Tab-separated table of C-alpha atoms and ligand atoms in Angstrom:
chain	number	residue	atom	x	y	z
A	1	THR	CA	29.442	1.006	17.365
A	2	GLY	CA	27.179	3.011	19.697
A	3	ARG	CA	24.774	4.651	17.213
A	4	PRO	CA	22.787	7.695	18.502
A	5	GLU	CA	19.415	6.023	18.230
A	6	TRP	CA	20.412	3.024	20.332
A	7	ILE	CA	18.994	4.470	23.571
A	8	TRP	CA	15.575	4.272	21.920
A	9	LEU	CA	15.961	0.678	20.680
A	10	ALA	CA	16.833	-0.134	24.302
A	11	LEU	CA	13.773	1.623	25.750
A	12	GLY	CA	11.570	-0.104	23.103
A	13	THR	CA	13.047	-3.541	23.871
A	14	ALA	CA	12.323	-2.916	27.550
A	15	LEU	CA	8.747	-1.641	27.115
A	16	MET	CA	7.934	-4.347	24.615
A	17	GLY	CA	9.525	-6.814	27.029
A	18	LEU	CA	7.562	-5.738	30.105
A	19	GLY	CA	4.307	-5.658	28.178
A	20	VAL	CA	4.683	-9.170	26.734
A	21	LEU	CA	5.336	-10.635	30.180
A	22	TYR	CA	2.460	-8.885	31.973
A	23	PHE	CA	0.047	-9.952	29.205
A	24	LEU	CA	1.487	-13.466	29.113
A	25	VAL	CA	0.951	-13.936	32.862
A	26	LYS	CA	-2.492	-12.314	32.835
A	27	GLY	CA	-3.494	-14.520	29.917
A	28	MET	CA	-2.517	-17.867	31.375
A	29	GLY	CA	-4.461	-17.129	34.507
A	30	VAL	CA	-7.606	-16.486	32.484
A	31	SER	CA	-9.849	-19.511	31.820
A	32	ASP	CA	-12.397	-18.013	29.402
A	33	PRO	CA	-11.595	-19.325	25.877
A	34	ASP	CA	-12.476	-16.147	23.910
A	35	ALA	CA	-10.411	-14.094	26.331
A	36	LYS	CA	-7.668	-16.703	25.915
A	37	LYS	CA	-7.872	-16.082	22.143
A	38	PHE	CA	-7.460	-12.326	22.630
A	39	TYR	CA	-4.688	-12.863	25.139
A	40	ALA	CA	-2.732	-15.131	22.848
A	41	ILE	CA	-2.904	-12.593	19.993
A	42	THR	CA	-2.192	-9.425	22.012
A	43	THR	CA	0.777	-11.047	23.807
A	44	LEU	CA	2.370	-12.200	20.569
A	45	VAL	CA	2.267	-8.690	19.095
A	46	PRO	CA	4.825	-7.150	21.512
A	47	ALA	CA	6.678	-10.438	21.825
A	48	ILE	CA	7.593	-10.155	18.153
A	49	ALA	CA	8.320	-6.428	18.455
A	50	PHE	CA	10.540	-7.341	21.377
A	51	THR	CA	12.723	-9.741	19.346
A	52	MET	CA	13.087	-7.194	16.512
A	53	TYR	CA	13.801	-4.304	18.869
A	54	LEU	CA	16.415	-6.559	20.487
A	55	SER	CA	17.982	-7.495	17.109
A	56	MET	CA	18.238	-3.870	16.077
A	57	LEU	CA	19.671	-3.035	19.499
A	58	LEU	CA	22.265	-5.731	18.802
A	59	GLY	CA	23.216	-4.468	15.347
A	60	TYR	CA	20.936	-6.430	13.051
A	61	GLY	CA	18.147	-5.429	10.699
A	62	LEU	CA	20.161	-2.422	9.518
A	63	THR	CA	21.390	-1.786	6.022
A	64	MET	CA	22.825	1.205	4.118
A	65	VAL	CA	20.829	2.191	1.008
A	66	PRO	CA	22.244	4.492	-1.705
A	67	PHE	CA	20.097	7.388	-2.956
A	68	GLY	CA	20.364	11.192	-2.960
A	69	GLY	CA	24.163	10.928	-3.015
A	70	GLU	CA	24.189	9.346	0.500
A	71	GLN	CA	24.646	5.981	2.206
A	72	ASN	CA	21.442	6.108	4.258
A	73	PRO	CA	20.718	4.081	7.456
A	74	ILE	CA	17.668	1.905	6.809
A	75	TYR	CA	16.261	-0.198	9.675
A	76	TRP	CA	14.585	-2.951	7.744
A	77	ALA	CA	13.948	-5.135	10.770
A	78	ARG	CA	10.969	-2.870	11.464
A	79	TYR	CA	9.110	-4.373	8.537
A	80	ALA	CA	9.993	-7.842	9.932
A	81	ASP	CA	8.224	-6.734	13.081
A	82	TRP	CA	5.218	-4.959	11.398
A	83	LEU	CA	4.722	-7.625	8.737
A	84	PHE	CA	3.259	-9.855	11.495
A	85	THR	CA	2.255	-7.302	14.156
A	86	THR	CA	-0.055	-5.069	12.124
A	87	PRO	CA	-2.347	-7.882	10.747
A	88	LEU	CA	-2.528	-9.467	14.226
A	89	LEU	CA	-3.795	-6.100	15.571
A	90	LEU	CA	-6.379	-5.865	12.757
A	91	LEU	CA	-7.422	-9.391	13.764
A	92	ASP	CA	-7.980	-8.396	17.385
A	93	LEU	CA	-10.168	-5.564	16.074
A	94	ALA	CA	-11.888	-8.003	13.687
A	95	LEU	CA	-12.661	-10.519	16.401
A	96	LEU	CA	-13.903	-7.829	18.715
A	97	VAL	CA	-16.733	-6.850	16.316
A	98	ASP	CA	-17.443	-10.220	14.640
A	99	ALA	CA	-15.908	-9.194	11.303
A	100	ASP	CA	-16.573	-11.724	8.501
A	101	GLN	CA	-13.851	-13.907	6.983
A	102	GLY	CA	-13.830	-11.868	3.768
A	103	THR	CA	-13.376	-8.564	5.592
A	104	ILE	CA	-10.448	-10.014	7.547
A	105	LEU	CA	-8.786	-11.495	4.473
A	106	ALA	CA	-8.988	-8.253	2.526
A	107	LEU	CA	-7.726	-6.369	5.601
A	108	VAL	CA	-4.641	-8.552	6.038
A	109	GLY	CA	-3.986	-8.649	2.310
A	110	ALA	CA	-4.156	-4.856	2.251
A	111	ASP	CA	-1.826	-4.901	5.234
A	112	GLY	CA	0.526	-7.247	3.382
A	113	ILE	CA	0.665	-4.828	0.441
A	114	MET	CA	1.242	-1.836	2.793
A	115	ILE	CA	4.261	-3.391	4.575
A	116	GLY	CA	5.734	-4.890	1.445
A	117	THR	CA	5.571	-1.792	-0.723
A	118	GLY	CA	6.798	0.121	2.333
A	119	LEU	CA	9.933	-2.041	2.667
A	120	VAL	CA	10.443	-2.040	-1.113
A	121	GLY	CA	10.293	1.754	-0.897
A	122	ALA	CA	12.762	1.803	1.981
A	123	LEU	CA	15.134	-0.346	-0.180
A	124	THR	CA	14.842	1.536	-3.501
A	125	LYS	CA	17.945	3.255	-4.891
A	126	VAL	CA	16.341	5.894	-7.153
A	127	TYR	CA	15.223	8.667	-4.794
A	128	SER	CA	11.991	9.611	-6.597
A	129	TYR	CA	10.701	6.001	-6.857
A	130	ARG	CA	11.029	5.665	-3.081
A	131	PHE	CA	8.021	8.018	-2.851
A	132	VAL	CA	6.073	6.068	-5.451
A	133	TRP	CA	6.263	2.930	-3.290
A	134	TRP	CA	5.631	4.948	-0.152
A	135	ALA	CA	2.542	6.302	-1.914
A	136	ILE	CA	1.135	2.839	-2.593
A	137	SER	CA	1.849	1.736	0.967
A	138	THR	CA	-0.013	4.770	2.291
A	139	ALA	CA	-2.936	4.179	-0.105
A	140	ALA	CA	-3.099	0.631	1.200
A	141	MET	CA	-3.125	2.019	4.767
A	142	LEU	CA	-6.004	4.317	3.992
A	143	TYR	CA	-8.079	1.445	2.660
A	144	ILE	CA	-7.451	-0.312	6.007
A	145	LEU	CA	-8.379	2.723	8.155
A	146	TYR	CA	-11.484	3.209	5.999
A	147	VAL	CA	-12.752	-0.385	6.532
A	148	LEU	CA	-11.935	-0.045	10.232
A	149	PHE	CA	-13.745	3.297	10.475
A	150	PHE	CA	-16.685	2.714	8.196
A	151	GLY	CA	-16.785	-1.080	8.249
A	152	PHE	CA	-15.960	-2.418	11.689
A	153	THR	CA	-17.486	0.446	13.689
A	154	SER	CA	-20.749	-0.232	11.909
A	155	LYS	CA	-20.624	-3.960	12.778
A	156	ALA	CA	-19.680	-3.173	16.377
A	157	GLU	CA	-23.203	-1.734	16.688
A	158	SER	CA	-24.578	-5.277	16.795
A	159	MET	CA	-22.572	-5.866	19.992
A	160	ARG	CA	-23.132	-4.745	23.593
A	161	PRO	CA	-22.361	-1.078	24.276
A	162	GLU	CA	-19.403	-2.244	26.345
A	163	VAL	CA	-18.030	-4.004	23.257
A	164	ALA	CA	-18.705	-1.214	20.773
A	165	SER	CA	-17.238	1.151	23.360
A	166	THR	CA	-13.965	-0.782	23.822
A	167	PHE	CA	-13.723	-1.061	20.055
A	168	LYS	CA	-14.267	2.664	19.271
A	169	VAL	CA	-11.426	3.465	21.680
A	170	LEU	CA	-9.234	0.793	20.049
A	171	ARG	CA	-10.303	1.939	16.611
A	172	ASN	CA	-9.608	5.537	17.625
A	173	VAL	CA	-6.224	4.722	19.056
A	174	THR	CA	-5.331	2.829	15.869
A	175	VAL	CA	-6.455	5.556	13.480
A	176	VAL	CA	-4.294	8.152	15.201
A	177	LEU	CA	-1.171	6.040	15.583
A	178	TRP	CA	-1.226	4.452	12.156
A	179	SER	CA	-1.754	7.822	10.498
A	180	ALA	CA	1.560	8.952	11.948
A	181	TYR	CA	3.711	6.240	10.406
A	182	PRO	CA	3.689	7.363	6.730
A	183	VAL	CA	4.521	10.908	7.810
A	184	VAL	CA	7.430	9.866	10.083
A	185	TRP	CA	8.700	7.746	7.154
A	186	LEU	CA	8.322	10.682	4.707
A	187	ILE	CA	10.314	13.297	6.689
A	188	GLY	CA	12.766	10.735	8.078
A	189	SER	CA	15.686	8.532	6.941
A	190	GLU	CA	13.649	6.623	4.343
A	191	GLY	CA	12.283	9.909	3.034
A	192	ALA	CA	13.452	13.515	2.949
A	193	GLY	CA	16.125	12.877	5.574
A	194	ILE	CA	14.866	15.954	7.414
A	195	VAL	CA	14.464	14.373	10.851
A	196	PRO	CA	17.678	12.655	12.103
A	197	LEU	CA	17.765	8.895	12.780
A	198	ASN	CA	17.855	9.280	16.552
A	199	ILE	CA	14.697	11.460	16.800
A	200	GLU	CA	13.085	9.090	14.272
A	201	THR	CA	13.848	6.022	16.373
A	202	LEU	CA	12.222	7.740	19.381
A	203	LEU	CA	9.144	8.698	17.279
A	204	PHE	CA	8.897	5.091	16.142
A	205	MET	CA	9.268	3.496	19.546
A	206	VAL	CA	6.645	5.834	20.932
A	207	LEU	CA	4.182	4.920	18.235
A	208	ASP	CA	5.143	1.237	18.273
A	209	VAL	CA	4.894	0.822	22.066
A	210	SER	CA	1.705	2.952	22.122
A	211	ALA	CA	0.132	0.857	19.352
A	212	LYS	CA	1.013	-2.537	20.922
A	213	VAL	CA	1.346	-2.226	24.694
A	214	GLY	CA	-1.031	0.743	24.722
A	215	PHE	CA	-3.614	-1.049	22.584
A	216	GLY	CA	-3.154	-4.297	24.539
A	217	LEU	CA	-3.534	-2.714	27.970
A	218	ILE	CA	-6.888	-1.285	26.860
A	219	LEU	CA	-8.093	-4.426	25.103
A	220	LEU	CA	-7.118	-6.852	27.859
A	221	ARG	CA	-8.543	-4.954	30.778
A	222	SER	CA	-11.842	-4.840	28.947
A	223	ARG	CA	-14.649	-7.322	29.581
A	224	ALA	CA	-15.372	-7.298	25.820
A	225	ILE	CA	-12.805	-10.058	25.146
A	226	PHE	CA	-15.145	-12.518	26.878
A	227	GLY	CA	-17.725	-14.540	24.960
B	1	RET	C1	3.408	-2.261	16.161
B	1	RET	C2	3.479	-1.592	14.901
B	1	RET	C3	2.405	-0.995	14.275
B	1	RET	C4	0.973	-0.928	14.784
B	1	RET	C5	2.832	-0.407	13.004
B	1	RET	C6	2.003	0.268	12.139
B	1	RET	C7	2.747	0.688	10.956
B	1	RET	C8	2.137	1.380	9.943
B	1	RET	C9	0.674	1.805	9.892
B	1	RET	C10	3.067	1.671	8.871
B	1	RET	C11	2.855	2.332	7.682
B	1	RET	C12	3.795	2.661	6.572
B	1	RET	C13	3.214	3.368	5.494
B	1	RET	C14	1.799	3.860	5.248
B	1	RET	C15	4.103	3.792	4.272
B	1	RET	C16	5.613	3.804	4.474
B	1	RET	C17	6.143	2.716	5.304
B	1	RET	C18	5.352	2.273	6.573
B	1	RET	C19	5.550	0.710	6.692
B	1	RET	C20	6.170	3.021	7.723
């Protein structure tokens, strides 16, 4: 079949793969419980991305959706990855700053909406309605970034500077990477079809790997994960 984007699915599989192992090993050597908590979460994130990147490399998670007069290539496995990976990341951020149960619930729920409306949008046949769904998903994302920026940051000020520091970095990395997803989606295959599938896959692996292995590297080398 050899699709053009495959080289990127292969690089993503590999990066996600190397990251899950390194974290796994690091985490089972650690004895501190809290740190163990953070390790178990952060290692799972790329582990899942790894399976999905593998599937897509092997020909799964792809479907052709009709809209705009075309049979467009829609990688739906991505939402199968992000449905569980994005909330887990919010959780790491939530545990880092002592977020309350209610804040976490609303965050994940928001996240659930964002990924669901996003997939629904990527599956929609009427071109215009694709952007309606995309719109809701993005609005849901903004709520999440808001809580993380205004909420969390504020509560991270009750922690040690080392903890608030690790968090700001993590929060900052998240805000920049997440912000880029709706835009890639809008000018890509699910959207205006301006950017070709291959460049889009590369944009997505870069963000994905940056947001999971990048985020993890920073979180796990920090002494903030300890109780
Ligand atoms: C490891 C993957 C991560 C951290 C993925 C984050 C993904 C997003 C913030 C995705 C957002 C989307 C929208 C705001 C609307 C359109 C569809 C999505 C799912 C691409």
